[PDB]
Symmetry: C3
Subunit: 340 residues, 3 copies
């Protein structure tokens, strides 16, 4: 919500409360999303200041507050900042921001990250360029310097983050994206590559000094219809775990396909169907093994722009013998959302 | 404060800063509330969206920020989310919200939870239905479908929460409350029952597979006067600790009595007197033992709706030989509060 | 930003997003400020309520949200409340607030704490009176009861805080400050003394039962110019570590000098030069040793009151043989800031 607009500075304080429950058989440990309370909240601000007719400064901060923890020793489990960046945008030249922000490969993966609760499986947090990540400097350009309607490109530098776990670390890297949208249709490509840390190279799974992620998208978002597909591959980038041996690392190679189709009815119902499959190859000791494999049926009803409720069913196609121990059981999510 | 009201959506951003100090003899370890700085802050939002003439969506989130921690390794001690839920309310049919919210037995215990700083001893957090707890779905009904002025009832389902400590866990359960208010007087009853987890059943103190909590209330809240009483009992529900053996568990049986009397003077002074006693029975190795036993003398001065100050003295009647090692010393609280 | 002003109560919701990176050779472990992403955000409120023509109530809360952590197990590293206090101010009699607030010796050290990113080296958090600290009651007086233009004084009581580390603890104490400002010039003195806890007295470094801190300031803040100097000394108060032996404690004696010079150009550029040196004496096993020793060159450009970017270079003069192992290498910070 826009709570302040004076002297060329506008501030948007936003947030939501999501009452959320997951249903899965038994513990949910062998299921797609687990079982139990999953309630959480969000808080954020987005600011915009008019520096002059051609220059605009901006910043944003976004936090996740879990609502399924006790008030005791686990009070903080799963709380974190999601976004924290500031930047400048000038005329048609382009914009530059630095901070914690979405990796550039998410410009493609965003096409299919549209499901009520799930989906976007390959857009991992703190996983180089596929998702939210810290210390990224990002140049973006809209309509190619103002000369070509609908053509956009982005270049992003990723600073090295040497963290205490291999899962959340990364080295220096550079990535980019290009997208063109014309009359309902959209197509987009993005590529990113970066060094791996000594800690990552020391993990049992994944072998190499370089990480690579790329993805292409095709979408149609015209006349209440939404159709989108993604394809992508990664090298030494997708985080995996062998639950049998309790071995963590990265997949040497992955192949990912994401499809989504949705329709928005005028009375507020938005049915959703989707398919996602992520297979891994050349995993030490295993070889080929599916990481994600499911169909999705769900729907969201929108009471208005502030209130909505949704159901999300995952028809999980992972088999019970999966060599990494990926969960094979189904998961259904039910939620009620208030946002401002 | 209402910081946004447009297009049928209104948002309330609230919070407070409480400068707070406790005085107790010596170190305060053997006292009712301890000793030292107890400053803290609150931040929250409450939202309300008009879906139509009869339907109203809503959400709320509330956080506690301790202000008596260093900026180092203990920076987070005692920080937690207190409330996080969203819901819908329709006409006179009733309202339903899910998330972290007050257990239904608090509908009764609220009568006496009115002291400046202390009191409400039996409304434990993450203790089934007596206080704030996660993953509760709650239906409430005002004026019995619009047919009976002043008669309210509520039904609440508690999802199972298998946490890493028995103190903060719970199984599935159902509870309810009923209340009637007519011209200053209020009477209310509430009951709740739920399964215990394997972790709770494994604790030295407390024996049984089921937990039970109930409470009744009588109050008068007319003409600057406030008088209220609560009585209640619990089975295998009230959390207790034997400090001698460092044994934690639940009390097999408790009996609780809470009394409060207050008057609000027009110039801003609100004196308060109270009595609270909670005795436990059939505690393994102990038998009967008082958990809470004190008189309270205090007062709040209200400068206006935003500023207030208060003193709160606990005349602690727990004796020094108490078999569980409950603190026997007095405690005085002094505080200054800014809220918006 | 002032997001609410009604019925005599005004609320200022503020915050910022700082995109920040440090450059230092290698890891930065042997450097002044380290190396890597240092992005962070702030959120805060400041409230003011008119009780009557002569009385005003107020409160403030301020939190630091780090933006250089993953979304995993380290999500909370470095998050903390910075300020949390409420108070009353009456006419010319004075103001009183209690809570977590700036120690009174910061009234002097503030003169030089003016650098874009660094500086203010001797204003340690949770270090008695030199910086932010919890449980302090503070009386302040402006213009000596309204009788003497420009003369201010402050008296502060520090409650004992027995924490789990000697670094962040303190005993009871009292301190004060006095300042006089006339036509661009400012001079200020402050002194504070307090008991040490048993845990602090048990540390290998630092010997004594009392802690003492004092500082004087001379500043000129007129006609776009800012010049300021500080000098100060401390006894058993400045926290130190011997990295060779991994021994933590306090410095028996320190001598600190801080100089800053800046000019604000009308087009938004504010160049900054500074010097800071803090030497320690009679450190057990070491004797005399420099704690801080550097020159500073930097600058901030102000696009307007909401947007700014800055560079901050530390010409580190600490030598590589320093007996405590204090870092000898340089550090450069680059940042982009959005605030509201």
């Amino acid at each position: 919500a826009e709570i302040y607009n004076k002297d060329g500075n506008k501030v948007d304080l936003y947030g939501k409360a999501v009452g959320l429950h997951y249903f899965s058989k038994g513990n949910g440990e062998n299921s797609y999303g687990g079982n139990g309370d999953m309630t959480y909240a969000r808080l954020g601000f987005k600011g915009e200041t008019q520096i002059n007719s051609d220059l605009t400064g901006y910043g944003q901060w976004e936090y996740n507050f879990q609502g399924n923890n006790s008030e005791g020793a686990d009070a903080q489990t799963g709380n974190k900042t999601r976004l924290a960046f500031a930047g400048l945008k000038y005329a048609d030249v382009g914009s530059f921001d630095y901070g914690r922000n979405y990796g550039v490969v998410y410009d493609a993966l965003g096409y299919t990250d549209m499901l009520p609760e799930f989906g976007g499986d390959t857009a991992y947090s703190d996983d180089f360029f596929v998702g939210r990540v810290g210390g990224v400097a990002t140049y973006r350009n809209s309509n190619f310097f103002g000369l070509v309607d609908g053509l956009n490109f982005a270049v992003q530098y990723l600073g090295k983050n040497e963290r205490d776990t291999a899962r959340r670390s990364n080295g220096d890297g550079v990535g980019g994206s290009i997208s063109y949208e014309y009359e309902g249709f959209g197509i987009v490509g993005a590529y990113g590559a970066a060094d791996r840390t000594n800690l990552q190279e020391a993990q049992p799974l994944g072998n190499g000094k370089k990480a690579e992620q790329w993805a292409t998208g095709l979408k149609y978002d015209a006349n209440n219809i939404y159709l989108a597909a993604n394809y992508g591959e990664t090298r030494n980038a997708t985080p995996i775990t062998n639950k049998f041996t309790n071995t963590s690392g990265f997949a040497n190679k992955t192949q990912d396909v994401l499809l989504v189709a949705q329709y928005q009815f005028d009375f507020g119902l938005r049915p959703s169907i989707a398919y996602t499959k992520s297979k891994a190859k050349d995993v030490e000791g295993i070889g080929d093994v599916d990481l994600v494999n499911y169909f999705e049926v769900g729907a969201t009803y929108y009471f208005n722009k502030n209130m909505s409720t949704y159901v999300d069913y995952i028809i999980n196609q992972i088999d019970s013998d999966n060599k990494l121990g990926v969960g094979s059981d189904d998961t259904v999510a039910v939620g009620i959302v208030y946002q401002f």
